[PDB]
Ligand SMILES: Cc1cc2nc3c(=O)[nH]c(=O)nc-3n(C[C@H](O)[C@H](O)[C@H](O)COP(=O)(O)OP(=O)(O)OC[C@H]3O[C@@H](n4cnc5c(N)ncnc54)[C@H](O)[C@@H]3O)c2cc1C
């Protein structure tokens with residue numbers, strides 16, 4: 021009972037990547053696996069738990085919460101199709117939303133509890149995972165390396181999968197701001213909220229707050245640069261800015277908070293770099309996420325971190341110490357659950373199966389649950405324009421007929437296909453509007469199969485759908501030649 | 511009379527496609543005949559085809575409206591609060607808004623004719639007079655006033671389909687989907703008759719807009735609705751229509767209908783069951799619209815089924831006469847008809863002979879909740895392949911544990927030739943299914959194997975990613991015979 025335990029693989033982080041690897045090594049290959057996490061259930065104080073950032077304070081609750089936010093649009097848009105009810109009685113109870121999310125998230129926590137009790141050679145250890153040596157993980161009561169040892173775990177192989185954490189800027193009064201972590205637990209919806217960042221978390225939470233805000237509430241999103249959502253298609257960036265604007269979100273571009281102080285009433289006084297001021301009840305920082313490397317004591321074994329602070333890996337998830345691997349947000353690349361999952365599965369097939377495999381980081385389909393949402397896979401046209409001599413862009417944009425009736429004329433569906441015009445290969449596909457995230461998944465499979473634009477236009481539409489726009493573009497709307505935009509070819 | 515390269519009888523999905531490509535792509539002279547310039551009684555179809563006027567478009571809009579019965583109830587779960595007892599569904603408003611949407615489309619097709627060189631719209635009833643002449647008359651009666659005689663080097667038959675009405679006493683007291691679109695009042699009790707997608711769709715529509723104590727019944731003559739769709743999906747959407755308060759009578763078929771003193775209809779079934787309803791909507795089938803064409807004047811061969819016979823290039827037995835869309839009784843979908851029109855016109859005026867592929871067409875049923883499907887159901891596939899595998903995923907979505915629509919099970923199924931892992935068919939029931947399936951259509955045109963699905967990186971969180979997370983077959987067919995494990 022006072023003895024070290026010995027394992028084929030120790031995984032630090034029972035999240036998206038770590039649980040895929042752990043489960044696969046144990047049930048596909050009969051390896052003996054230990055999995056360390058700091059908490060068995062979602063919430064304060066450590067927020068991520070068993071199941072990772074995605075289950076506890078990420079993809080899962082944010083989706084249930086955006087689902088809730090969509091009803092403000094449904095209730096309003098119902099009028100146009102003939103629905104009548106007292107508009108004046110309509111109230112949004114945040115406490116019911118939060119309590120329902122809390123139950124859904126705890127159920128997944130509990131299902132995970134049972135997986136670990138039941139499955140041979142897959143064990144759960146509660147605490148903070150640190151590297152003592154090439155073959156020993158120590159599990160401490162806290163992230164403080166001086167805290168009590170609960171366990172020592174011998175591992176032939178060690179998987180680093182501790183994920184990421186919110187980045188807080190060093191500004192005066194930062195202690196009066198929150199991250200996405202605390203947002204999930206606010207006991208009441210803020211009347212006034214600044215969400216700081218042009219990234220998918222700022223935009224997603226702005227929509228949530230915008231819908232659950234009490235009477236006379238206001239949601240402000242601020243971003244240091246000119247146009248939110250860097251990395252996504254410029255048409256889609258511009259349009260989702262109009263659509264957030266049209267739903268009563270104030271977008272402050274080229275603005276950045278310099279300091280936060282309390283007003284005498286407990287509210288927050290934000291001073292921007294520009295000298296502008298805003299009073300809010302909540303300042304949610306969402307300016308980025310950083311690899312959680314601190315607490316691992318990587319120094320003890322000399323695991324190399326990148327310039328940026330991520331664990332350096334090759335294509336096979338291998339650090340500079342052989343037998344020590346890193347996957348998911350700790351590698352500080354694409355910060356997505358299914359990428360974490362694919363990397364973990366590829367790592368286990370390589371180390372423990374004998375089917376070596378490297379995750380493909382290109383043509384990865386992803387979504388933004390803005391209202392309305394983004395669906396995207398592959399290159400945006402300006403990235404394409406720098407790698408291929410001739411890029412074609414197929415664009416279709418329209419107001420869905422249903423929104424001529426709903427009264428939401430402002431909800432432009434946008435569908436964009438980017439091709440290598442030399443040979444028709446689809447490089448990239450971008451969608452804005454309802455069902456964009458469900459449309460784009462299958463588009464992922466197409467691109468992995470090197471679909472050309474003719475493979476798309478030769479497929480017969482399903483009518484009536486938004487999706488059918490993708491099988492209806494025969495003529496490029498414009499081109500890039502040698503990196504330069506033009507309606508026509510010379 | 512006037513001179514044309516192409517006369518198109520019918521200005522619908524396939525006819526307008528064919529007409530538009532002939533004029534704007536090949537510089538041909540084109541006459542198109544339809545019987546009405548905009549939607550609704552007396553002829554229901556018009557400029558646009560059945561889809562635009564009394565089919566895909568209005569029905570989608572009206573299903574969109576019916577969905578708000580689920581949205582309003584399901585919002586409680588996410589903490590939305592309002593006086594439920596003040597909730598009322600105004601059908602008149604829905605119809606008026608549908609009507610405006612359809613009229614603006616009819617007007618934009620007028621627009622297109624006025625502005626398109628070599629493309630002419632003629633109002634009236636087309637029929638063949640001889641091999642090279644289309645007559646347009648005042649009405650369907652082949653002895654009404656000639657309006658136009660059109661000399662044509664090529665003639666395209668594109669008159670579409672009509673609701674099949676069975677030969678039973680009191681069939682006059684029944685409506686079709688055409689009249690459903692124009693009901694002045696939402697029926698309190700209604701009987702949709704038929705297991706196909708039109709009966710199911712309308713059942714959903716009426717269920718939402720029904721006045722206070724109303725009731726939607728759907729009856730089908732055989733034991734399970736929606737023949738031709740995956741059997742699991744067929745069983746599940748049955749469960750889910752019942753759950754939302756729609757009575758499904760299986761193995762029941764109307765024997766007659768009579769008038770009640772209050773203007774309601776008394777339906778007697780073959781079993782001798784009886785049901786009093788405000789409306790009986792017949793949706794047992796659709797048949798090629800071939801009567802008014804006078805096909806005998808030239809001897810265009812019909813199939814036993816009633817549809818105009820064509821080869822794979824939509825050519826009839828008469829040299830310069832072609833048929834596309836519903837009139838050929840192949841797949842009765844708009845994009846299939848558009849794809850035949852385009853294909854015919856390239857063949858005849860483009861010397862690039864193209865045939866339309868009728869395999870692995872994606873289709874949708876706009877049930878609540880909706881179906882999305884492409885390619886073979888496992889039963890058809892078991893008759894064509896030694897080793898078929900079926901991968902199955904079925905769950906209540908987390909959002910329906912919260913809304914309280916616990917009954918809304920999502921179903922994803924992939925059918926494969928297990929010999930090589932080739933994806934034969936994909937079948938979805940759940941929110942987004944019709945959106946999910948479109949690109950699956952592109953996938954089946956790229957010889958996607960099951961492993962191509964499960965090696966694609968998921969988009970999380972979605973229903974769609976369930977397609978890319980199935981690696982172990984649930985069960986198999988070996989020489990036609992369902993079994994859980996392989997014999998080895
Ligand atoms: C608000 C938000 C929304 C998101 N939405 C989406 C989305 O919709 N779709 C999507 O694809 N991605 C989304 N993401 C990103 C997604 O959550 C991550 O990419 C994914 O969770 C990363 O998985 P991972 O395996 O790298 O680590 P994680 O899932 O983060 O798991 C790491 C685990 O390690 C634990 N841990 C850390 N240090 C230690 C230690 N020393 N010892 C023990 N345990 C430790 C943590 O408690 C955590 O449980 C979202 C992220 C956030 C913050």
Ligand SMILES: Cc1cc2nc3c(=O)[nH]c(=O)nc-3n(C[C@H](O)[C@H](O)[C@H](O)COP(=O)(O)OP(=O)(O)OC[C@H]3O[C@@H](n4cnc5c(N)ncnc54)[C@H](O)[C@@H]3O)c2cc1C
Nearest residue numbers: 520522524555559560561565566636670835836842843844
């Ligand atoms: C209620 C309903 C819902 C449907 N929903 C969908 C759906 O969601 N998706 C889908 O893909 N398909 C759907 N369909 C099927 C779709 O409507 C048809 O497959 C499609 O419209 C067929 O086009 P077509 O060119 O064959 O004929 P049509 O589109 O019907 O065009 C035929 C035209 O010919 C005209 N005409 C007829 N006789 C004459 C004559 N003698 N002279 C001149 N003109 C004449 C008619 O007025 C009509 O406008 C639906 C059908 C119905 C009935």
Ligand SMILES: O=C([N][C][C]C1=[C][C]=C(F)[C]=[C]1)C1=[C][C]=C([C][N]C(=O)N2[C][C]N([C][C][C]C3=[C][C]=[C][C]=[C]3)([C]C3=[C][C]=C(Cl)C(Cl)=[C]3)[C][C]2)O1
Nearest residue numbers: 418419420421422484485486526530567568570571618622
């Ligand atoms: O809503 C929605 N969605 C979603 C789904 C749905 C639905 C419907 C409903 F109820 C619900 C839902 C929406 C809106 C709008 C949309 C679309 N867009 C448009 O419109 N487009 C334009 C262009 N195209 C092309 C094709 C070809 C052709 C040609 C000619 C002939 C015919 C055809 C058309 C056109 C063109 C040309 C001309 Cl001239 C014409 Cl007139 C037309 C396509 C595309 O969508």
Ligand SMILES: O=C([N][C][C]C1=[C][C]=C(F)[C]=[C]1)C1=[C][C]=C([C][N]C(=O)N2[C][C]N([C][C][C]C3=[C][C]=[C][C]=[C]3)([C]C3=[C][C]=C(Cl)C(Cl)=[C]3)[C][C]2)O1
Nearest residue numbers: 039040075080083084128905906907908909971972973979
């Ligand atoms: O709803 C819905 N949907 C839709 C979308 C969404 C969502 C969520 C939310 F809130 C909203 C919306 C539903 C429910 C149920 C179902 C199904 N089933 C299951 O199970 N799955 C899960 C999983 N996957 C992938 C992978 C997984 C795994 C891994 C490893 C090992 C184990 C497992 C995804 C996910 C999910 C969930 C979770 Cl929690 C996770 Cl973490 C993940 C598949 C699927 O779905």
